Structures are given as C-alpha cells and as structure tokens.
Design a protein around this nucleic acid. Structure first.
Ligand SMILES: COc1c(N2C[C@@H]3CCCN[C@@H]3C2)c(F)cc2c(=O)c(C(=O)O)cn(C3CC3)c12
Ligand SMILES: COc1c(N2C[C@@H]3CCCN[C@@H]3C2)c(F)cc2c(=O)c(C(=O)O)cn(C3CC3)c12
Ligand SMILES: [Mg+2]
Ligand SMILES: [Mg+2]
Ligand SMILES: [Mg+2]
Ligand SMILES: [Mg+2]
Lengths: 692, 711
DNA sequence: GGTCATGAATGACTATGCACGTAAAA
DNA sequence: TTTACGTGCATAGTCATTCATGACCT
C-alpha cells in the first residue's frame, strides 16, 4: 500500500526525483488533489525486463502500487490518479531519469500515455528579478527572450529541485494555473518502440555511437529522444571521458584545480579533505560530494594511480582493499609533486577559461600539462554509445617517445614501440603478452593484455610476492579457498598470507607433499584465479578537436605535441607581452629621471597634470601614470641606475623569447629540453617487467 | 573436534584476527571507529595482533545486568571476541593475551575508553583483575625538529620537548583516522616502540565506588559537585585512569560543546559555523552559496568534527520555526514546521547569513574580541563574538552536558532591549520591575503562553522552572479548527496522537481528523466530532491533557559567563552581567578606532611638515646614502614619519593633495575628540550603548508572536 | 546465454552518551 | 517508585542501478 513513502480525475500523482524534491514538493503540493512521490536514484532500465521481473525491483514496484495499475496490463480500471507527472531535475541526469521513466511506461504501461495520463512537469532553469518583477526561464532560449525587454535584473540559476523553496516550486510546476506542463503523447507504437529500443537496448549500443555523431504537447518519441540525446552527449563530453592534453575527466580537473587554489602545493602541509571537496562542489562541480571524494581517493591512491596526482594523509585504502579508505571527515590531503607537471604554468595564460556554474568565478577548461598525462596516468570510464580504458605508461618511456616524435614526426609505430613497449603498471608482476600483440594494441587502440603474478618455489609451498594490477591479495585467497570447498583442488593443504611492513605481498600456497608438481598447480591457478588477469584497452578520449576518438599510441603522442607546442607558445606570448608593456614603462620613467625637476614643477603647477606630462615629454596615457605613481624614495640616484640595468635584463630576455617564437625549430628544442627535464625530475624506472 | 550440533557464535567478522594461536603471544586492539580500524588493521603485526572496530559510543553498562549486556550488539562482539561471559570469572577460554583500548587522543576518545573500562571493571572484573586490560597511548603531536622525529603524548610533554630545543615543525594528530599506517605502527602498536599502559584493578572497593559516582544515571547530582571540586613500562589504576579520563570529557563537553557563552550566546559548533560563513563573505546582502562549502570550510579550518553533525546544527540556525531570530537564511529545502528534520541533504542546499546575524559580527574586524589559535595554528579564531544585542536570551539554547545541562527559551528582541536599556540606567531594577518588560518567552508561534505570571516570575528569578503552551482554536459546527500549534509541536504528531485514541476506542466522539493547511493558511487541523450536540469544550480541554496541544517547556538558565565558569543565572542577573560585557566590548572598539586615528594623525603631522620645505626633502633623498636618518634629524620627525614621506607618491606633490591632507587632519582630530570623551566619561558610554540598542531594536526588531494568557 | 566489475552520476537508516522533567503505570 | 520519551552535538557503513564491454562461471 506504500505507507509512509506516499474526484479521481481531479487527482494527480507527482513523481519527483529524489528525497530533496520529495520533501519540497510534498510541501509545495495542494493537499486536496495533489499526491507526491520521490523516485530515488536512477530506476532500472525496464525496456528489456519482463513485466513479472519488473515488479521485483522495489522502486519500480512502488510506482505500480501507487498508480494502482499493473505492468503489461490493460487493466487501467483501478488507476489511482488522473494525471501522472515526471518531476525531474533541470540538468541532464534529470531528464535521463525521466527517460528511464517513460521507458517503464511506454513498455509496461502503454495504456497510460495512450489514453494520455503521462505528463512531464517543466521546472524553470532560471529566475530573474527586475526590481521585484519576477520572471522564470525554462532554458537558455527563453532567458534571452526575456532579457532584451526591461532597474537592472538579477539572475538566479536553479541547479536542481532541492535548492528551490517550496513557494517557488508550487508556482512554477505544481499549481495548475501557472505550471508549465507537457502532455506527452505516445502516437504510433512502431516509431516509438523502435526508437527507444535503439536507445535502451543493452544489445544495441553500437548504433547509438553513430546516432550521436549524426544527432503544449510533445511526442513521447520526439521528447524521450530529445532528452536521451542531451544526456548522452553530456556524459561523453563532460563526465566519463578524458580530454587528451592533461588526460583528465572534469570532476578530476575540478578537484585538482580546486586543490591548487587552496594552496595545497606538495611543499606545504595537508588540509582536511572535507574542505577540498567542500570547495569543489562549492564553486566548480555541483554534484555528489561522496562521488567527488571517491574520485579524489583514486587520484591519491599509489596502487591505483601510476603517478598519483594527490598525496593523502591517513587511511586512503590498502592495496588489498582499495575501498577501505577512511571517511572524508577524517582524511587530510595535499597535491602530489607530480601534479606540478599539470599546474605550474596556469597563471601564465596557457589555457582557455570558462564562467563556472554561476558566473561568479572562472575555471580553466584544461590544464597546461608539461607531459602527456593521458598515457602515464591513463583512464577508465563508461559513457553512452562508447567508453574508454587507458593503461598507465612509464614516464621516461613515454617522454623518449615524444622526444622522438618531435624530431621525426613520421616515426613508424614499429619504431615507437621500441620506446614505449607496454603499459607500465603500479606493480612488479609481469606483463605477459607477445610483442606482436601489444604492438597491435597500440597501433589499433582496441585490444587486450594479460598480467601474471610472480612467484618462486620453496619445498611444497609456492611463494608469491607480486600480484597483477588491481588484484587484491585476499580475493585471490578467496578464489583459492572456493575451489577447496568445491573440492576442485584436492592438492592444497593451506594458504598462508604472510605479509608485512617488509613484504607488501607474500602469499604462500602450501601443496601436499614435496612430491607434487607445483608448476601445474601454479599453471592451473593462473588459468582459474586472478593470479593471471586480462585488461581492457579502449583508447577513447576527447581530443583537441573537441570530439571523442579512439586513437593510436603514436597518434596520441603526435596530437599531444601539437597541443604542447600551442601551450609553450601561449606562455612565451604571455611573458613577452608583459616584458614589453613593462620595458615601455621603464623607457618613459628614466625619461623623467633626466628632467626630474620639470616633472615636479609640472605636478605642483598644474590642475590636471597628466596631459601636461604627455605633451611635455611626449609620453602617453600609460607612462604618465607610472610616473605620477613613483614613490619619492625612487628619485634617489641609486634606485635610478637600478632601473636602467633592469632594462638590460628585460630587453635581452625579450630577444631570447621572440627568437623562440619566431623559429619553429628553436621551439622544438625548448619543448624537447622541457620534456628531458621533467622526465629527469619526476621520472622513474619500469616496474611491471615484460616477458613471454 | 567432534561433530557437535549446538555450536558457538560464528565470531564477529568485523574482527580482523591474527593467525598465531598462542594465547599469550596475542593481543587484541579495540579501536575507536572504522577509520582507525582500517589504519590499525594496516599497522598491526598480523601474526600476533588482531583488530576490532568499536563503532559509536558503546552503552553505559554500569547498571545494565550481565544478562542484558549482550543485548547491545557492539557490546556483544567484545564478549564474543575476547571469548568471555559477562559477570563470569571463566577466563579459561579467553582468546587474547592483552586487551588494548585504542582510542583517539581527544576528549571524545577518552570517553569511549571510560565506558569501555566500565564494561570491563563491572562485567569482566576477572580479566581486569588478572591485568589483561591495557590502554594504548597514541601521541597527540609529532615534532619534526631536524631529520629526527619526536612524539608527545600531550601538552605537558610538548612543553618539555620544545623548551629543550633550526626550527621545529609541530603536527597535531587530531585522531587516529588521519595517522598513517607507519606512524601508528611505530607509536601505538609495535611492542618495541609503543607506549602502552597496563590497568590494575587492585582494590575493587575504591574503584566500583568511584565509577558508580560518575556512571550512574542518578548521581548527576554528585558529578556536578565533583566537577566544581576538581577545578607496559608503567601501570595505572582503572580508577586513577577513568577518573582522569572522565573528568577531561566532562570538562570538555561542558565548556567546549553543549552550553553556550553568555556574550554572544553560542555553543562552539555554532560560533565556528557563523564565523566561517562570515569569512566566506556570505553577507546577508549577497547571494547564498552551497552548504557543503560552508561545512567544508568549517571542518577544514575551525571545528575538526563530524560534517553531518555540524551541518545539522547549521540547519537549526536556519529554521524560522526553531530559531526565534534565524542566524542563517536557508535557500531550498530546510524542513517544514510539521517535519523539522525533513531538510534536504547538504549537497543540495545553499545558504547565506541572516540579516540579523550582523548583530554578532559587524564589530569583529575592529579589535573587539579575543582571538585564539585554530587547531593547527595556521589561522586564528574569535573566542567570542561582539554581540551587539543579548543573543543568548533572544534566540536561546538547549543542550545536555555532563553533571549539568542548559535550557533557555527565546525572547522578544524589543522587550529585552527595553529590559536592558532599563538596567543600564538602573542597575537595581527589581526582577518584578524588569519582568514588567520581560514578562516571559516569545516563541516562533502565535499559540498562547498559558502559565501564571506569579509563576513565570519564579522561573526568571531562579532560572529553573517550567512553563506550558497551548494551541489556538475555534469551533465551527461540530468541527474544531486549529490554527496555532505550540513551539515545536508537529501537526502530524498531533493527528497521530489523536488517531491512537480513536484506534483504541478512547475517543469514539471523533469520526475524522483532517489536516487542512496551505500557502494562505499555515496551519489548520480540523477535528471532526460526532453529534453536533457534544461539548467540544470538553473534547478540547480533554485533549489539552492527553495530546501535545498543551505541552510543557523546560527552563534551566545554565551557561558559561564571563568568568569562564558554568552557572545558573536569573534573567535579571544575565542582563546585568551582559551589560558589563557590552560595556567592555564598546570600550575595546573605541580604543581600536582611536589608536588608528592617532597613529594616522601622527603621520599627517610629519607629512605637512615636509610640504613646507618639500624641496629640501627631495634633495636630501637624492643627496644621501640612506636618507632616513637625515630627514629625521633635519625635520625633527621619527623613524615612522620618515618612511611615510619616503612613501609619498609624486601625485601628492600637487597643491590639491596638500590642502587635502590638511582637511583629513581636521576630520580625524574631531572624530578622536568625540571618542575620548566617550571613553573618558562612563555615563556618555552608557548613552552610546543605550543608543545602539534602540537603533538595533528598530532595525531588526519585531512584535510578540505567542501571547500570554490565563487558563 | 548469463554474470561480473569498472568510476562517475543519482542520501536515509541505524545505536548510543549526557540531564532531567513529562508522562504512563506497578 | 519505576520505565519510556524527547531534546543537540558528539562518535559512517549499507543499500540499487545507468551505461559499454570483454572474460568468467557455474
Ligand atoms: C555508526 O554509528 C552511528 C550510528 N549507529 C549506527 C551504527 C551501527 C553499528 C552500531 N551502532 C552504530 C550507531 C548512527 F545511528 C548514527 C551515526 C551518525 O549519525 C554519525 C555521524 O557522523 O553523523 C556517525 N555514526 C558513527 C560514526 C559514529 C553513527
Ligand atoms: C539511497 O540512494 C542510494 C542508494 N540506494 C538508494 C536506492 C533505493 C533505496 C536504497 N536502495 C537503492 C540504493 C545507494 F545504494 C547508493 C547511493 C549512493 O551511493 C549515493 C551517493 O550520493 O553517492 C547516493 N544515494 C542516494 C541518492 C539516492 C544512494
Ligand atoms: Mg541534479
Ligand atoms: Mg555513493
Ligand atoms: Mg576523536
Ligand atoms: Mg549523524
């Protein structure tokens, strides 16, 4: 009956997204004829689930029990409500859930939208306040519509239902006599059921990819497609996929940038995690804080990140149990020194900047990597229509690669592979794939590679000291003892996890007699436990072109170098265009230092003395002021000859620079040197060796 | 051995056990909380040391019966883990050689060790007696003088280490969660370098005598008194240790947690929040900003504690229906009066400061408050706020410490500003006379205060007492319309209370209860009687004694006063004592602005002195090696005034900017005069403060909401 | 053909310290 | 008399399910 959680055509059920809007709407509603219900989290994709299974999922079950109908049942006779309304966020995840919702309907309750009982409530994206003359904007288009028409107006963005007070909620989406509200119409089944299948078919993701690259009342179909597209593109671009420059997803950059702006350089002390995350949401990334903090754990985990961006203090998980990390109220962290490579050149105008979600700040669109992080750190996420997996690589190995690629851009992949053989993982276990096939993986982006734990033999016990990337010692001990219980192995006596401060890993497997052929047991285990494991390779990522591509290893390096060339440039432009504007001021200054007396005369003698100084010395608006802002202490003969040498340095530094810009070839040497440098600073030897 | 049928309890599993089965080579660390769990589980030596999280504060078992003790799951696992039966000397099956209490080196950590000792002293004496109980002492600090580390258990040992000490960098271990495995290992776990006290239960009498005194839900009396009275290389006594430890806790939670200070009238979690909000510049005139950033900053730099706990104490200050005068203004879902705890999660909401809040904060940048080092000496925080008004009696506080608590009803601003303006002039005002001004509480509701005056005054002159409130209703036909509920009574609870009577045939005289409420009508509970002939007066003056439509309210004017000590204080007393605080605050402020005006006046002096012979000024700098001494000797002006001239921008050499700095001399000269009169003359000060109260009781004031009534 | 796991997105439950006065009962 | 309530500020692990996809698994 739904207790607690929860004429007849005058009635309307309000299905809102999440316990926030739950409380709010339940308030906002008109008690007489408006019932409320939170849909909590994303509901299951029902499009391929049997009406009978569909009710097994509780949050789904509850909707049926509420509307008083049944999945795959024409029996609308007990229908509890006149109008059923999908009350979602204004954001993407908002419309996604709605899409996931229409799906539960169109498929399992077609009858409903057929007779037209399904409505998508339309909450405002904005709220403007001219003097007191309120407006609401459902989107970007209407905002402009309203803006060219009026005191000066004051925007507020509605980043979602929970941050809207009930009074503005009722007026905009609840009370019928002001609520924007679409009557979604199914129409033909075939175009519909056809279109949504393409969309939510766990089997059909392939067409989706394409589709994207190709792509009052509204139609269920027209709408649930307009939405799901909005969704897809967002999670491809602005969530699950890295950009190539720095190799970072957005929550990833937003964290790392936020951490910079809280002054958390590696050289200093750590600061509570709550506050970093507290700032990340507060000003750049308004979503989960848990999600955030967890994405911030990964970056700080030695065993998950080949080159950590963050250095945590306290419990940040163990190699054995990554997810065992302590709550954010406990951990403190700062930045990794390796994160210098992503940030040190930020102040120096090397990056686009865009905004933040309320225009009150600006956040950088990418960071100025001094190295190609996307390959060293690598990534692993799932979007829509596509996903991405990218193996960590050795800094020094990849630097050589790029150094080579800079010099000779036609370098065969066969050659390149001689520089960057294979991923280099955070452990010492062996990467056991044939050269041939790794080269295939690299040249093709798609592929797969295997790792094998490392052992020796001692009597009737097998001694293991290295497990493969991301494999928990215990889970191995589990898998092993499972076969023992299943009695698939009658060969083993015990599995002792020795281990300590001295040996990070030390799993002893004890056979029966000093007569058994461990080789077989180990060879067997390899082919039945995680002591041997396979690893996905899908080099997808957003490229400089702003679009998602699956790229080669040589391609990725080539393209990156085009991004580093453009960066070092922006940067020299930056430094120069200051040295100029500055040498300019110096120039005019020691012009006054000649006739210093006149300047003082002109000042004491004149009302507006600025134009006098311009006419008299032939100096412009900008130099006139540098002089008027020259403290008396400066008139000293010392501090005079001092700003004459400062001209010397300045003017030489400038020549050195504009030569660098001028000459594509003396630039490459700069970038080649700046690679060779950091590979020295932050480089490390290989860990996971390569075998047969 | 054999294939038994009845089998023992599996083992807690949240126990991370050792592998070595020898009895004495073993040890169990009982660590406070899941973070310290994982970290200890890491630091420990797998072989002979097992680990087990205790999560939360375990129940106080000093009066729970051995049979009942295993009721409580968290207590169940300590018994199942050590393998021993409560109130039983049967140690013959005991799983570990040492039981080690490993808590935070904070106040709360010392409390969870006290409760733990109780559990043992009382239900496992045998164990404690055979000396199997131990207390690991994690260090509170790590000093890194050079390349050589030093650890200090507490403050005394930090004093010793640094005064013997090229610069020391100190680090506070705010608690185990944030230690790293290596550091934990070295300091608390690993035998050959760990500080580890053995606890002795050598004479039960003293001991159980003492623990009764602290841990018995009735002797709160003796605790209050006891408090006012007190303010393995080594072994200690369970009694020696738990007294030391329970006292630290009792002290801390009184002073630095539950009770408010008299000045601004806040508990620390509250003040730290509000300050943190100020420091984000979340001024009332400006836009709100995600709550998760406010709390993010609060635990980040001031209050090193739970974020939820903290966030929630923040919710309260935002709620129009619980704070008489909100200190925060909440945007988005912040609860309904009918479901106060229904508030959105913190990732959702944004909030800025109450306009009101300026009364606590406006005067902060102007040398009014003391400042103390935050918890890592990298920022400062105000010890109290410059409350312009007496917030403590306006908004009120409600809390429970140890050996005492504190309950304090909100009041009307205007009545209380009146009530003090009085006391400022007449410090002898009778309670009676003052009570004329401050008749009673003023709650965020329009329901009526139904306690006798004769009796409300006793509440005010003893600080202790009790007053009751009642809902406002009307009769229409055979239905009772209710519009005003008492302070903190939920419409729903009422409906529910009501239905329980119907449901148990105790009120067959009502056939329905409908809640009508809405935008235009805040509250309207309708009760639907049966016959129109029934006497609704009875119905209701029956309900008034069986639902919370008439509900009682606790008064206990306990707080920390200027003395830094807890007291219970008359309403009269409070305001008198508060005046002496605003006196001292206003003072402090005028000295601040003065001492800046003067320092400036001084600069202007030596300044227009140069304007005379400005040319000499220029030659002397152009002429000398270091011009400072010369200007000084030549113009007769000091090191300070010399620099000033030396930092005189050329634009100031214009005739305009000269006459200009003349005026400014005149301006200031007057201002400072007004100010020193005010300092100099006690009665002109009162006049000032008198004035500022009137201003504020105009600017942020309001009329009474809950009326006073007789029944 | 059917499961699994991967990291980013969409927070309410639950037990307990403490004082101590109201309320319902033995 | 006694036992069950409420109160705020302290001490987080658990739960479902999107989306893409290759390898177990059983
Ligand atoms: C886990 O302990 C808590 C419980 N209980 C649930 C647990 C189940 C196991 C045994 N009982 C405990 C008590 C609870 F109900 C609430 C909170 C809680 O709100 C909180 C916080 O920071 O807000 C922190 N904690 C823990 C960090 C102390 C809570
Ligand atoms: C209760 O919602 C969540 C569930 N449960 C909710 C669903 C219905 C009731 C319980 N069963 C499922 C799982 C869950 F398992 C995980 C998370 C979660 O991780 C999360 C976050 O912010 O990180 C937020 N939430 C809340 C925003 C919903 C989660
Ligand atoms: Mg949202
Ligand atoms: Mg989560
Ligand atoms: Mg603690
Ligand atoms: Mg809590």
């Amino acid at each position: 009956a739904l207790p607690g959680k929860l004429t007849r055509e005058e009635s309307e059920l309000f299905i809102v997204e999440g316990d926030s809007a739950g409380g709010s709407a339940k308030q906002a509603r008109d008690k007489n004829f408006q019932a409320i219900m939170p849909i909590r989290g994303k509901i299951l994709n029902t499009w391929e689930v049997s009406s009978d299974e569909v009710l097994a999922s509780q949050e789904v079950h509850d909707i049926a029990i509420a509307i008083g109908v049944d999945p795959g049942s024409d029996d609308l006779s007990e229908l509890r409500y006149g109008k059923i309304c999908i009350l979602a966020d204004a954001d993407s995840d908002g419309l996604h859930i709605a899409t996931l919702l229409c799906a539960l309907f169109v498929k399992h309750f077609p009858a409903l939208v057929e007779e037209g009982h399904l409505y998508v409530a339309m909450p405002p994206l904005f709220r403007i306040d001219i003097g007191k003359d309120v407006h609401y904007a459902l989107d970007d288009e209407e905002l402009e519509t309203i803006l060219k028409n009026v005191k000066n107006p004051q925007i507020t963005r509605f980043k979602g239902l929970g941050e809207m007070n009930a009074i503005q909620l009722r007026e905009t989406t609840m009370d019928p006599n002001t609520r924007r509200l679409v009557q979604l119409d199914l129409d033909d089944a075939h175009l519909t059921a056809g279109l949504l299948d393409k969309l939510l078919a766990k089997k059909r993701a392939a067409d989706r990819k394409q589709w994207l690259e190709q792509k009052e009342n509204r139609s269920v179909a027209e709408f649930t497609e307009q939405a799901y597209l909005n969704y897809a593109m967002y999670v491809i671009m602005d969530r699950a996929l890295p950009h190539i420059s720095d190799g970072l997803k957005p929550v990833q950059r937003r964290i790392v940038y936020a951490m910079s702006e809280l002054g958390l350089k590696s050289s200093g002390k750590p600061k509570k995690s709550a506050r970093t995350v507290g700032d990340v949401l507060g000003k750049y990334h308004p979503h989960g804080d848990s999600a955030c903090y967890e994405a911030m754990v990964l970056m700080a985990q030695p065993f998950s990140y080949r080159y950590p961006l963050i250095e945590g203090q306290g419990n940040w998980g163990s190699p054995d149990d990554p997810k065992s990390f302590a709550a954010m109220r406990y951990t403190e962290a700062k930045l990794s020194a390796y994160s210098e490579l992503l940030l040190s050149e930020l102040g120096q105008g090397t990056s686009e900047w865009q905004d933040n979600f309320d225009g009150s700040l600006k956040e950088p669109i990418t960071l100025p990597a001094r190295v190609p992080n996307i390959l060293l750190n690598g990534t692993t996420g799932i979007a829509v229509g596509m996903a991405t997996d990218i193996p960590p690589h050795n800094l020094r190995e990849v630097v050589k690669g790029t150094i080579a690629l800079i010099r000779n851009p036609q370098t065969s992949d066969e050659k390149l592979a001689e520089y960057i053989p294979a991923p280099d993982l955070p452990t010492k276990a062996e990467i056991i794939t044939p050269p041939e096939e790794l080269l295939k993986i690299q040249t093709t982006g798609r592929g797969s590679y295997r790792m094998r734990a490392v052992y020796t033999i001692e009597k009737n016990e097998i001694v293991i000291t290295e497990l493969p990337y991301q494999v928990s010692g215990s889970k191995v001990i589990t898998q092993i003892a499972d076969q023992m219980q299943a009695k698939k192995l009658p060969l083993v006596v015990d599995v002792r996890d020795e281990s300590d401060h001295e040996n990070p890993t030390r799993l002893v497997i004890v056979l029966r007699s000093n007569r058994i052929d461990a080789e077989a047991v180990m060879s067997h285990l390899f082919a039945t436990t995680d002591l041997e494991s396979s690893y996905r390779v899908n080099l997808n990522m957003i490229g400089e072109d702003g679009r998602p591509q699956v790229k080669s290893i040589r391609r990725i390096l080539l393209e990156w170098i085009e991004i580093r060339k453009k960066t070092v440039t922006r940067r020299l432009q930056y430094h120069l265009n200051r040295i100029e504007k500055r040498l300019h001021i110096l120039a005019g200054l020691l012009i006054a230092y000649l006739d210093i007396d006149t300047v003082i005369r002109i000042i004491r003698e004149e009302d507006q003395p600025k134009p006098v100084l311009m006419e008299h010395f032939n100096i412009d608006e900008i130099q006139a002021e540098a002089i008027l802002e020259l403290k008396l202490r400066h008139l000293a003969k010392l501090e005079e000859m001092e700003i004459r040498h400062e001209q010397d340095e300045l003017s030489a530094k400038a020549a050195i620079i504009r030569e660098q810009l001028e000459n594509p070839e003396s630039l490459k040497n700069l970038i080649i040197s700046e690679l060779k440098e950091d590979a020295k600073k932050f480089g490390d030897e290989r860990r996971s060796p390569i075998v047969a």
